[model samples]
Target: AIKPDMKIKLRMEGNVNGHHFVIDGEGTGKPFEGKQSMDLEVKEGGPLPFAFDILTTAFNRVFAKYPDNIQDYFKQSFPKGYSWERSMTFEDGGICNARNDITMEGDTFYNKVRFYGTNFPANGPVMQKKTLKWEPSTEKMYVRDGVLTGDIEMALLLEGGAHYRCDFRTTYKAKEKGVKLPGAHFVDHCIEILSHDKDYNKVKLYEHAVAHSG
Candidate 1:
């Protein structure tokens, strides 16, 4: 769970894993500023709806305060003719169909979904597939007890349109000390958007409270 004064460390790089940008709280959460975390989910595939919800929630958590169409640029911004709205699963336990051909490996995962947009050069078949990768990390902070945190890295491969590219990694850790986080349960899904071409700016969100997760 995130709070108003917890320190954070966030990094984003290009899809090619080019550069790393960071953002951190100046000891307080009033004005959180850093590079965009974009929309990369985790490293592995999971129960369909959970995957999607976590992706959006993480995206909102990081970029909801940026300037100039930040949310639209990442969340609502899609290639012309593309339709991929943020979906939630709060009602029906968030049930959805998973691709039978998809495979999950380690703490990281990736998948391909339908693609669209007039900017896409190829028609039908070329625009039908888009890939995403998930990278999750579950290392505890030695300084804090009962506090568990992890990093979820998401990667996306473009299928069409002007090759709009972004590679961002998301970090999900505990909000404060003494808070017992589910060691096995995942709380947040972060996407540090990156790209193969021009790399996005980078910044550190915040730093560890005291070198441990107490």
Candidate 2:
């Protein structure tokens, strides 16, 4: 289980179309790593969906750092919704980008809402299949008693449209010391989106989240 305030360290390694990249760093849940380093090998492949994965990984990691902030933002911006977009240039001359537009229509106080978005270039077949693994480690925090654990899987799409999918399952137990989180069994949740042909010309959007039970 992850707490609201704790330093996180992550390691990532993957190759896209033979272009290899590795990231290692520590951060306080911001897009920018507090003290991090990266290395890339850009050869034949130009840009791929893997790049977007890196971008979203950093975004989600940082977003998880501030759960209360997310709740607050949802409370203030729900129904009307909010959007974010950013692009980054890799040292290897590859460009990775992402845009997220989220809107909530139901009651916001109980986390019964929906999240959806689109990814550029679409989610399609991988020019050359690649493996991407992200392992995040953290020490016990004020509210969490054990290490938080999970991994996000992404595919390398070089052509057509692309979509994002994530499945998360973790057991959260309340600790005796400090502030304690409500002990609840987190049910497995899977978010999946498929690419649309028109997404190439227009931003392709898909529903990504579903209600969960404890």
Candidate 3:
């Protein structure tokens, strides 16, 4: 469950479509990373451009609905783990493809989520393919001062037809208070997109605002 007053920060610095952009923001609310319901505000930097924006929008839409299938999927895939596929269509006529793979190593859990598709506007033709990949591996869990602390390595990929490959590192810390019960707070989240030719032409960085809701 997620609680109130929980805060999260996300940062991304990478090259896309011959331009370099850095997005940094901090928002309030418990965003269920692999589950539905994502509430984020850009406190620093700004949203991605056209192509990258399309990829990210689809990425959020897919993960937002993941928890609905976890109960059944994990039940059958438990102990030995498993993988599954799903697809979603946006209101604007765009399509998304999702591949979910989960497994447990010892007592720790590992998840790989891959998404690819297009976010074409209504009546628009599919012109580009966007892909977002995330791999989260959990570390040993422990308790301190009545709080749970754990480490997770998160790797991400954002690509629109080989224009660039973005890498992101996100850290999640569980909080003990808020709505429902427990909540996860994110911090030190960073991203870097690499260019095959090593040429970054444009660079812009700014700060944005965050909003919280029920």
Candidate 4:
């Protein structure tokens, strides 16, 4: 469930070694992080060692201001070709921004991200960049009936050879002129992540939230 304040509450259920476990987490801010007491049903195990702290991600976002054209929608300004500047935020409230020049004329979509931060790490200057790419060859992210819906698979790596992946998938429903946003239109999106965790080894998290627009 979601609310106007943009708080995310997720109920995660998974099976490890045929043992059932459910974690109902509630927290605020990016990467919907929350914690709960151990709710476990173990079949056979010894005494646990450390404590628990459940971490979640943010996959619930609805973009209310966008166009139906996929190309034009990415074009921020100036000459519109297939070029856009995508930026993201770091934990220190700084920005890790980059520009992409993609001109592909095919059915599939593919691109990579090389992060160069105007906002580096919180402490000193260190290159903690991850290698990222978008692959949609099997079922390339497509737009049918003026609606864009599909999964966008991406790869992420960290220091000490952190073999993890961060997947982003979304479905944008085209709103006609007789809609909100001053009778303009809006885009419904779900920027989700299927990250490879180091602690849980097989922790699958789904974060759903609503983002407001002005």
Number of the top candidate by lDDT? 3
TM-score of every candidate: 0.20, 0.27, 0.29, 0.29
Candidate 1 displacement at residue 174 in angstroms: 12
Clashing pairs in 2: 29-62, 122-161, 122-162, 123-161, 123-162, 123-163
RMSD of 4: 16.5
Model 2 compared with the native: what TM-score? Answer: 0.27
Give one digit per residue, the lDDT tens place, for model 4 in 1-214: 2122233233434322233344443334331221111122212221211111111221122212223332323222212123223333433333433333322222211222222334333342122233222221121345545544334333333345543333333333322332211121223333223443443333333333222221
Candidate 1 C-alpha error for residue 186, in Å? 3.1
Better of 2 and 3 by TM-score: 3
Question: Candidate 4: where is the Cα deviation over 4 Å?
Answer: 1-4, 16-19, 29-59, 63-148, 162-214
Q: lDDT (CA) for every model shown?
A: 0.24, 0.28, 0.32, 0.29
Clashes of 3: 13
lDDT order, best first, reads: 3, 4, 2, 1
Q: Write the per-residue lDDT of candidate 3 for residues 9-93, one digit (tens) a residue.
A: 3343333333344444333332334322222333232344334332332211112212342221123334454444444444445
Model 2 C-alpha lDDT per residue in residues 1-214, reported as the tens digit of each score:
2223333333334344344444332333222212112222222232333433333232221232223212222223433444433333332233343333433333211111111223322233222222222223221111234433222232323333343333322222212233223222221212111221221111111111211222
Q: Which residue runs of candidate 1 sit more than 4 Å off their true CA positions?
A: 1-3, 9-155, 159-183, 192-214
lDDT preference between candidates 1 and 2, better one: 2
| Clashing pairs in model 4, backbone N/Cα/C closer than 3 A | 60-209
